[PDB]
Amino acid sequence: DKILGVAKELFIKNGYNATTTGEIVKLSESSKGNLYFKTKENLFLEILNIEESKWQEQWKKEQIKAKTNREKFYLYNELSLTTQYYYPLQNAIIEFYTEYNEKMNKLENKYIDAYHVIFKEGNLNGEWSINDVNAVSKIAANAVNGIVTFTHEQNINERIKLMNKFSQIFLNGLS
């Protein structure tokens, strides 16, 4: 945990490659032997799992505010911009994909799961008629991740504005 906490801080601030197990160990005393997650990957892939969940929990605690699935969608994407979980590691996560199908598969599904529920319960609630949810969930998720990640610099309220103009276009698109 002293490892897992320092890593997150190092992976968020500096890169994936730019923070190595040398600097992580020196950051939390616990000697290199203690770091045995097997590889640097495993350490990192474990953090993503943690953070993806800390987000997914926060989303459940905050989705009550949404009455309809339409609102659930809008909101989920809005919250993605503001959260302190997962989405601030996406630079690392990108840098990770270049530098290297396993525990990754269980994450990518947990990552799209929030949209799966929304679109599934959305068909049950009759708000739209999407027939291939897995496609639309992976699309929506990644598009959103794009809007969050490829604008992390400019004014936060513009960001929120853009994401909502997105959510509108997308949902309107499905229906």
Strand segments (E) across the chain: none
Which residues ranging from 119 to 138 are in contact with a copy of itself (CB under 8 A)?
132, 135-136, 138
Q: What is d(CA 155, CA 147) in angstroms, rounded to the nearest whole number? A: 13
For position 16 contacting a copy of itself by CB under 8 A, the verdict is yes
**In DSSP terms, which residues pair with 152 in a beta bridge?**
154
Work out how close the CB of 54 gets to a copy of itself at its nearest, in angstroms, rounded to a whole number: 19
β-sheet bridge partners, residue 154: 152
Residues 25-64 that bind a copy of itself (CB under 8 A): none
Count of residues for the chain?
175
Q: Is 165 in the site for a copy of itself (CB under 8 A)?
A: yes
Nearest residue to 160 (alpha-carbon basis) of 75, 34, 90, 66 = 75
| Near ligand DEQ by CB under 6 A: residue from 97, 99, 165, 173 | 97
Kindly state the smallest distance separating residue 54's Cβ from ligand DEQ, in Å.
Answer: 6
| Rg value, the chain, Cα | 18
CA pair distance 116, 109, nearest whole angstrom = 9
Minimum distance between the CB of residue 52 and ligand DEQ, rounded to whole angstroms?
4
Q: Is 81 in the site for a copy of itself (CB under 8 A)?
A: no
Of 4, 104, 117, 160, the one binding a copy of itself by CB under 8 A = 104
* Phi and psi based region of residue 39 (left: phi greater than 0; alpha: psi -120 to 50; beta: remaining): beta
127 binds ligand DEQ (CB under 6 A): no
Which CB, 50 or 143, lies closer to a copy of itself? 143
Q: Which residues of 77-102 are buried (b: 16+ CB within 10 A; e: fewer)?
A: bbbbbebebbbbbbbbbeebeeeeee
- Residues 59-88 touching ligand DEQ, rule: CB under 6 A, are 80, 83-84, 87
Binding positions for ligand DEQ, rule: CB under 6 A? 48, 51-52, 54-55, 80, 83-84, 87, 91, 93-94, 97, 104, 107-108, 111, 149-150
